[PDB]
Amino acid sequence: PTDQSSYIVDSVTVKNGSIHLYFDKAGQKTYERHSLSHFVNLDNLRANNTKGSLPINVIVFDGKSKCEESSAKSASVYYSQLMCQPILLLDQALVSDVGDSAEVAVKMFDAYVNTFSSTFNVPMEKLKTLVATAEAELAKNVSLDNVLSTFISAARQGFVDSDVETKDVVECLKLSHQSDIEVTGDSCNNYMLTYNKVENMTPRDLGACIDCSARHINAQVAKSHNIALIWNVKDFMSLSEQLRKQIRSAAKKNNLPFKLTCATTRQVVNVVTTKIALKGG
């Protein structure tokens, strides 16, 4: 029994700004984890869409309507091929009482605080006051980016280097929570597996790579030396969504750690790595 194209979501559970979607795969109970943010507005997960792409491998439909379910199952034959993964078909009835903007934002913020605390080794007692202010402000409908930025600027003293910008920590936290990416304060390398070829990059992707001095590393040279791919958050974000996903999946294929950093310092080239250049020269 191979990985079909879609699976029906039977049940749902929420905890720490994340949702679990439960399905039966060849008689074994399984789940996929997604950030709660994709479930505030369900329209982005409907098969009709407005762009023709899904932010996650999930299709929301109305289980009360026969056509919506069958249409979504048909649509997931296309998206499964486009995304190179099966699609989870979720009835909108399972995600009725999930959250309410701020309600979900407070769950998000609490997850940001845990990643900030464990990344910069900051004791939770030192943040107690700044967390209380931040949570009472989110309930006042003060933007999450404002509350997060205000929190980081105040909480950063003595834990984050003066060289790193608050905005880069903010993006690291947000992204870390969206795609479950490890965050570090360590020097980046902007190393990329040889699998992601220059020939298949767009001018924006090749140029962005050359701009951040991205280097190519061979999968085996990286595996045997236990090399982690550490990208600067800004540099990584200058890349396309497709390229960002490809770099990460290639690292996961070879069991290589993938991390985002808020640091701008580069780690010393101690391994045989070739700088990404234009196909000609």
Author numbering: 1665 to 1945
Text from the published report:
The multi-domain nonstructural protein 3 (nsp3) is the largest protein encoded by the known coronavirus genome and serves as a central component of the viral replication and transcription machinery. Nsp3 can be divided into three parts, including a large N-terminal cytosolic region (~ 157 kDa in SARS-CoV-2 with ten distinct domains) followed by a transmembrane region (~ 20 kDa with three domains) and a C-terminal cytosolic region (~ 41 kDa with two domains). On the other hand, little is known about structures of the transmembrane and C-terminal regions of nsp3 or their exact function in the viral replication cycle. This part of nsp3 consists of two transmembrane domains (TM1 and TM2) separated by a luminal ectodomain (3Ecto) and two Y domains (referred to as Y1 and CoV-Y) in the C terminus. Previous studies demonstrated that the highly-conserved C-terminal region of nsp3 is essential for subcellular membrane rearrangement, yet the underlying mechanisms remain elusive.
In an effort to understand the role of the nsp3 Y domains in the coronavirus replication cycle, we have determined the crystal structure of the 286-residue CoV-Y domain of the SARS-CoV-2 nsp3, the first complete CoV-Y domain structure for any known coronavirus. As a result, a shorter construct (residues 1660–1945) was designed and used for subsequent NMR and X-ray crystallography studies. The structure was determined and refined at a resolution of 2.4 Å by multiple-wavelength anomalous dispersion using data collected from a selenomethionine-substituted crystal. The completed electron density map allowed unambiguous tracing of most of the protein except the five N-terminal residues (residues 1660–1664). The CoV-Y domain of SARS-CoV-2 nsp3 has a twisted structure resembling a letter V with linear dimensions of approximately 60 Å × 50 Å × 32 Å. The 2.4 Å-resolution structure reveals that CoV-Y possesses a previously uncharacterized V-shaped fold consisting of three distinct subdomains named Y2, Y3 and Y4. The N-terminal Y2 subdomain (residues 1665–1763) is dominated by six β strands (S21–S26) arranged into two nearly orthogonal β sheets (S21↑S26↑S25↑ on one sheet and S22↑S23↓S24↑ on the other) to form a β sandwich-like structure packed across a hydrophobic core. The middle Y3 subdomain (residues 1764–1847) adopts a compact α helical fold composed of a three-helix bundle (H31–H33) packing against the 4th helix (H34) with an axial tilt of ~ 60°. The C-terminal Y4 subdomain (residues 1848–1945) consists of a α/β fold with two three-stranded β sheets (S41↑S45↑S44↑ and S42↓S43↓S46↑) in the center flanked by three α helices (H42–H44) and a 310 helix (H41). Y4 packs tightly against Y3 and the Y3–Y4 interface is dominated by hydrophobic interactions between H34 of Y3 and H44 and S45 of Y4.
